[model samples]
Target chain A: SLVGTSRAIQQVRQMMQQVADTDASVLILGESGTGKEVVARNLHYHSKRREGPFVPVNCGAIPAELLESELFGHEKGAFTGAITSRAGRFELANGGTLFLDEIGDMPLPMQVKLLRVLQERTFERVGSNKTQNVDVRIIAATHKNLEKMIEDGTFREDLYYRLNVFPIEMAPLRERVEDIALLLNELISRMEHEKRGSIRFNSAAIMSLCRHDWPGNVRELANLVERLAIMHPYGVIGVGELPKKFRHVD
Target chain B: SLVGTSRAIQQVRQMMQQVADTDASVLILGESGTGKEVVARNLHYHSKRREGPFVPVNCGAIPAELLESELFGHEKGAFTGAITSRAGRFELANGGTLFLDEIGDMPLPMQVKLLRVLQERTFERVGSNKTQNVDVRIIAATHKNLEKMIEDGTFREDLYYRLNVFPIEMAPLRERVEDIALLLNELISRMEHEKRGSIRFNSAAIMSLCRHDWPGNVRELANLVERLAIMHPYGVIGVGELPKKFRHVD
Candidate 1:
């Protein structure tokens, strides 16, 4: 769930609803750990692609020399590492959504190939002549400044324009401190629902959390909640009991 | 030696020369791979503390739970992991420069402690009551927007001011394409000096390289040069022989 009542988050939710049914290529930009993937999944779950598989690929995680084959797959004899034939992310997500995380890290060569695929909706497996059609919708995300990357020439302007059809920016948690309590509750309830145990936070502790800067965003809050559950085990935590960093108040 | 021929680089070098003798905390801000460490080293090497050791700590690479101990040392039996007493980066860099790389990644708690040390120039080891004096010129660097981080509350405002006494910004390689040829020669000659073998690039090849938007900056260019040296070992490379990504021209 997109758990936040702040105007910043409400605007993000509105944008997601407005663009979900359109099946347009959506670009989600946010600081790392700002829940970009959560937005991507929510959109796919609400869109026409709901029934199709959702394949996530970290463009930055794959090696550049192998990214082409990873995206388009490779034939048995594609390269020295190709011991057998395999399906790439595109093939795997044919009827669904292809979530390209850290799109900015994709190599320049890979960007060109990806642009061609996005424009034509078809691609050939590495070392294979047969071109295959795919009906996958792309939802790319990155913490990097793509506009800056574009000006710097690392990111292709055409690809950026193509993918940025509908942009959704996630507001960092520090900007939406109002969401801290709600997120804490949601995270706690989810943990209890999963029988993972639970903990409670006093108003002082909540206020302190709201005051402190959360660099890691919701992910950081979630981790802190989990840590609290283990440390307190159903006990109520106050400002004094919180970690020194989170103890913003006496 | 810092290498570049563009006005952007010349400005950076000039700033380094002006700030080096001040013994002031210098903040180096640039994109990753733009050589923040290189600038830090140059400043330290040119400073009065050049005779002292240069200590570099990657604040982001170390774990948050261990960072305090890493920077301020830990007494024997300080915690489960502290088997023996050890000197921290602050103590090690005394009479020298302490390079804190990726300072933006430092946790909020550590930022507070760092600010104290900066203000008082003294720190006590973890689990120890004795205060130790330190005399280190701090040089902090990060690719992240520290101003933004401060606004978001992830970074402390006081700490930012303390470390940003003299800021130096490195221009990305794409912005200084004129430096590409000069850098190529420097890198090639360095490789030759190291007995790592050597390679040469024709004007066309160099032109194609200059046209590239090097996402990884100098680090990327250095890697490419090394790869080329291995692929062509003492041969002259042309644009046609360059990788497809670098083949901005035919």
Candidate 2:
């Protein structure tokens, strides 16, 4: 599902394949909108744990006070919110991949707990004394410089080494402009399948898109395609049809 | 000096050498504390304009009300506090290199005037109708994403293209940890030159420093060296002597 033929993309695929079966921790690094989560899902689907669930938890999205219970589950009456015993991401992803998105945004206290879990491969549920063992492959993604975070003491260095077993850096869209056409085709096809109607880009439009510096990367391109489908369903779009910012060429 | 022998730094040096004589406008992009201004200075020193002054103006640090006058000068009694005619950065940097630091912070209105000057290489002093011709090579640096700013309408597309003709990106210090030892040496030697008692780092200490993430890049390293010099003058620092954040390995 990673639609790109550029050397950078090819290398990323190669690395994913190389480590897919090994169950090694992967840290996907790139700017936002560079399809980091897509890579995480691909790694999950291609690995030996394909039959198992692929659980994702955005560390930054969850409130800090609830993150521990969210990741390690909670027993009944675990604080006021727990009406019943519940499993968390670790238990749900016991035999599969645990995608820790925005790992850099994880709070310092949570970092220590995560490090302990990673090191011991076991964690206790909230309001329970029994420790549960977990076997899950971690695939962490972030648009941050984790190393820099460690120096600032916001991120723990021990956890950094633990999750960085195999690092795959996603190249920004502008760096791999050769893959624009393929991405356009794939995005448009997805739109068609969604019953949103299909759209086509003329060669000039494609050229202009290629010339554009895609600060938002593939995500932005997909949005543009969806917008076009809504505006001119099943129609061919020329360079002039694109938003003013995308019209890099005449 | 840009004290790094990493491939990223070497490539930067190569690019600087290649473009130093061409008089092309160079845009230096990197995070704060990445020593962008140092690179700009090196470019100026290596260029044919070495005899001319290398003037630097931090666009973001200057007041918005005064920035126009700061860059374009003001005629006598141009406004309140304009007691006398004064030459701005452009006039002072004539036949030299003008380093515009944090250019992304320039107001939208200022961006338009800057684009015009970049196009015509001429400008008029504030409150004066007479035009002034300038020949300063522009070297702009910023930590902000200009492309993102363009999409957000905070930056002008034309100005970005104009300033980005010769782009040079500085790698964060953690990315070039191989240069830490050399940087430490250079920083310590400076302390010795300044009559501050010299301090030496044992191999273990050096190794520990190399393991640091350096969130603030070389600026942080310099500050650390200065602090260590004051704390342990003429003493050898070992692994245990480093601050807690820096003690990555025993």
Candidate 3:
């Protein structure tokens, strides 16, 4: 289940559905840990391009110097770390979607270089001038405000418009307070099903999770749930036993 | 303790602090289970009137016919249940904050009378015409949108204005994502300190909790933490053991 019935989530779902039929580039905006990748995955899984591979890159995770080679692929002797020729994310995701995460954090040099690839839909492997065509759809996400970044002269204005063709802004978790229990149920059962671990929370426990205004978003929820399940694998939890701030002290 | 860090919460804290020195009436606005009482308590405990009694009444909880007496108190034999003379919340909370919860749910007829009390700062026991002067500060809270309710003729414009002298809107839990861990930390430690329960979570577990858009707000989170603490007095939890939606498939 895509996991929510709150107005905020429904809107996200509707947007994903409308864009699933097309190959338009999408830009997802929100704070980190809010599940931007989930939306990216949703778009890919529900799209006509579902059968194709979905490759992703955390633009901020890779160092500025190596990110170019990482996204564009490297030749056998492209650099010191480039021991063998390999397809870049763009090449690997051909005929599917390419998720460039934390795109705002992408280095300006890389941004300039990536913009050209977006325009040409082709790229040259590192150390090789031979251009290769790519049939990949691009879906990018970022916690940084690209508009602000562009205004600050940090992000390329041209790249912003290109990625934002089908803009989908994620509503912060607080807007969808009604979906926590369902999310918890989905999370717990899934973990149990995978033989990863087994844990069940009482209704009292489920109720507590709903009151939290998840500033870190879905990322935080997942972390807490995993911990709870593992720490208390077999037990019948009570309401009074939860965290202090959660306890209503009148 | 980290609850004061998130922008929304910090805003609330600031607002509460500003109003704490004065007796200006405040109306807290938010969804039910969003912790209206908590804000009221914060104002009371942190105010100049902290030494006085802090009384509260749920306008929507009592029977409509009995609610008037509940707020304004009653004289002996004023009604079948009124066997003895008693002070109403208004009288009980003299020199302190009187928290009127679910004020929006007060019947329309009661709204008019309540408005008079707000204006005159005086009230009589149910069977008495004696107008006892009040030195109490009023702090009302409601989940309903009084503005919308005013449009629907379900709430009084005058009362809304009277109570809205200084308004504070509390953000639901989903908005305070980063603060959940801090809240959990406080909750777990407090429980441990009290010798009520003991439990600890791995970072992975905390991550899941942050991701969950607590649809229910703080009340819900407290419930879950309390439940966990009780069910498993001592343990270390992990991500794999959490609920289903929390389990991410990369």
**lDDT tens per residue, model 2, B22-123:** 566788999878889888988899887888999999888898878889999998776667889999999999999999999999876578678778767999
Candidate 3 structure quality by residue, lDDT tens digits, A84-183: 9998888898998999998988877678678778867889997575899988888999888776876565776556655666677887776676887777
Which regions of candidate 1 deviate over 4 angstroms?
Answer: B1-250
State the lDDT of candidate 3 residue by residue for B139-194, as single tens digits: 89987789999999999999888899999998887777778787878878786786
Candidate 1 lDDT (Cα, 0 to 1): 0.86
lDDT of 2: 0.85
Q: List the DockQ of the predictions in order.
A: 0.01, 0.01, 0.01
Candidate 3: which stretches are off by over 4 Å?
Answer: A1-250, B1-4, B243-250
Runs off by more than 4 Å, candidate 2: A1-250
Query: Distance (Å) between predicted and true CA of B1, model 2?
Result: 3.2
Q: Per-residue lDDT tens digits of candidate 1, residues B1-250? A: 8787788888888778766765667889999889899889888889989999899999999988789899999898766667799999999999999999999998766886887788678999986879999999889999999878766757765567567656778888999999888898899999999999889999999888888999999999999999988888898999877988889874
| Chain B TM-score by candidate, in order shown | 0.98, 0.96, 0.92
Candidate 1: tens digits of C-alpha lDDT, residues A1-250: 8888999899999999999877799999998668898899999999889999999877765657778998999888788746567789999999899999879989999999999999899999999999999889889998889999999999999999999999999988899999888898898999899775678888999999999888777766776775566456688999877878888964
Docking verdict class for candidate 1: incorrect
